[PDB]
């Protein structure tokens, strides 16, 4: 009879990547894309001013 | 001028609670519900055999 | 100076697909840049752009995220927009515009300024 | 989105004018980017903004930008008459996409 435990991915699509930044101090960023939970999102503090 | 910063909350409220129970051969469950924004989880291995 | 011009007044059925050119001219096609906003009379513009030619990379305003694709080709320097799927709604005039690149041909973050010139305008219209 | 720009206005010649845009944190707010677009009807929009207070070179010194908050004000004065110029905010938003406002139709009496 067997059953199923887990399973795991050999190969990746990655499609959209929209992003979304904010200013130095209003918070660190967001966007409707990560209640998805299909996606994947790294908050990284990098960029600058002006 | 002030700018926002996180929010959280002080006061919780939960909906409608769902269950999908495996086994014990099969191991995890899955309750499609998960992988929402919107639903929280945590698998606790349970008491029933026959 | 510079000069941005596309193709004239034209018409499509509903359903159809329209192609239109932007042909830069008088600038270095270099730190390229090029917009699509779209204006019909009596409403608000919307920007429905892409945002690189150098790499030929495009973002899409969700609204028409998949309907517009676009093809850039600096033999004849020109971007070609096409709106597939059209509808009674979308008769407008799309205009084609520039926001130089940064240094690197990446295009992220704009110039301060967006849009210094602006393409001469297309009317579209549908039946 | 869609900018908040009220429909039309009006006034004496050299009277002071100011067409104020309304954004959100996500936009306006939390950005320098702001543009206003004078677009003569039949002809193809120009700049008359660049990074709020600045002006393109080729500008009439008349403009002038400002911002508090979520706002976007182009205040005009010394008015030359003929210049009503279907004026449109428009800005960078933080997703990364731009978007202009209602349009301000504006009235020369």
């Known amino acids: 009879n067997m059953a199923e435990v887990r399973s795991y991915c050999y190969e990746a699509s990655i499609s959209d990547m929209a992003s979304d930044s904010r200013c130095p101090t209003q918070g660190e960023a967001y966007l409707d894309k990560q209640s998805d939970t299909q996606y994947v999102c790294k908050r990284t503090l990098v960029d600058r001013g002006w | 001028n002030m700018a926002e910063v996180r929010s959280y909350c002080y006061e919780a409220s939960i909906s409608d609670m769902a269950s999908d129970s495996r086994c014990p051969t099969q191991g995890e469950a899955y309750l499609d519900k998960q992988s929402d924004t919107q639903y929280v989880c945590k698998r606790t291995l349970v008491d029933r055999g026959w | 100076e510079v000069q941005l011009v596309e193709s004239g007044a034209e018409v499509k059925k509903p359903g159809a697909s329209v192609k239109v050119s932007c042909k830069a001219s008088?600038?270095?096609?270099?730190?390229?840049?090029m917009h699509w906003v779209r204006q019909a009379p009596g409403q608000r513009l919307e920007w429905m752009g892409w945002?690189?030619?150098?790499?030929?990379?495009?973002k899409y305003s969700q609204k028409f995220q998949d309907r517009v694709t676009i093809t850039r080709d600096t033999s004849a320097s020109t971007a070609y927009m096409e709106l597939s799927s059209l509808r009674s709604e979308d008769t407008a005039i799309y205009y084609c515009?520039?926001?130089?690149?940064?240094?690197?041909?990446?295009?992220?973050?704009?110039?301060?300024?967006?849009?210094?010139?602006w393409g001469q305008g297309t009317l579209v219209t549908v039946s | 989105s869609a900018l908040t720009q009220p429909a039309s206005v009006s006034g004496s010649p050299g009277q002071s004018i100011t067409i104020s845009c309304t954004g959100t944190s996500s936009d306006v707010g939390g950005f320098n980017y702001v543009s206003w677009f004078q677009q003569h009807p039949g002809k193809a929009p120009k700049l008359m903004l660049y990074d709020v207070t600045s002006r393109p070179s080729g500008v009439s010194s008349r403009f002038s930008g400002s911002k508090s908050g979520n706002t976007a004000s182009l205040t005009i004065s010394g008015l030359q008459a003929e210049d009503e110029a279907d004026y449109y905010c428009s800005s960078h938003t933080s997703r990364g996409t731009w978007v202009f406002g209602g349009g301000t139709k504006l009235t020369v009496l």
């Open positions: 945002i690189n030619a150098g790499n030929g990379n495009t």
């Open positions: 008088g600038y270095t096609f270099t730190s390229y840049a």
């Open positions: 515009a520039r926001d130089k690149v940064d240094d690197y041909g990446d295009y992220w973050f704009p110039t301060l300024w967006y849009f210094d010139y």
